[PDB]
Amino acid sequence: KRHRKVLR
Amino acid sequence: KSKAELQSEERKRIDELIESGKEEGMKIDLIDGKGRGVIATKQFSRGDFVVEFHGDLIEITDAKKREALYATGCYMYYFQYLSKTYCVDATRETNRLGRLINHSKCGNCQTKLHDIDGVPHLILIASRDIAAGEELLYDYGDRSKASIEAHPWLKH
Ligand SMILES: Nc1ncnc2c1ncn2[C@@H]1O[C@H](CSCC[C@H](N)C(=O)O)[C@@H](O)[C@H]1O
């Protein structure tokens, strides 16, 4: 249902 | 100017923008298929500060707690800093615009970690000239099979 944000 | 002098000047510009929280040259629009987005209302030049991704700076234990309760949209930005996981949690509705910016792997902003005297900030820098009227976009960076199955827009 959810996603995230990740610094790359 | 030397490399160091240019870096110093840029840092000063960024620090001062973080402090003022000044968010000029942008506005909210409804973008087909995305909900709200933020669009440029002036040209930005490659390398310009655009906006802070502004919210509640938290560590990993709290970020897990909060995400268990949210699971409400997705406004959490994880990053690594001094060997620990932090999150900028922008779930709470404010007038800050960084939190409303949508995703593209081939966007026009790049997120950078910006340290001010030991406090990490996530900032968006223009990765190319940005036209007036165009949507601001950066890579959210979640490439997980679980996320992309559910949110195929992460693929583009
Ligand atoms: N490229 C994209 N395509 C479709 N939806 C997107 C998108 N980028 C971001 N989003 C949407 O925006 C969410 C992150 S919060 C960003 C602002 C959001 N559009 C809002 O109206 O509040 C995602 O969970 C998804 O709902």
Domain count, chain B: 1
Output the CA torsion B21→B25→B26→B32 (10° steps): -160
φ/ψ bin of B148: left (φ > 0), alpha (ψ from -120 to 50), beta (otherwise): alpha
Q: Which of B79, B139, B154 sits opposite A3 (nearest CB)?
A: B154
What is the experimental resolution, given in Å to one decimal place? Answer: 1.6
Q: How was this structure determined?
A: X-ray
- The number of residues making up chain B comes to 156
Closest CA to B87 of B58, B65, B118, B121: B58
In the structure encoding, which two tokens stand for residue B41, read together? 């209302």
Residue nearest to atom 4 of ligand 1 (CA): B34
Phi, psi of B10 (to 5 degrees): -65, -45
The CATH number of the domain where B82 resides is what? 2.170.270.10
Give the domain extent around B138: 1-156
Q: Which of B71, B113, B139 sits opposite A1 (nearest CB)?
A: B71
In the structure encoding, which two tokens stand for residue B46, read together? 């490659």
Which residues on adjacent β-strands are paired with residue B88? Answer: B57, B77
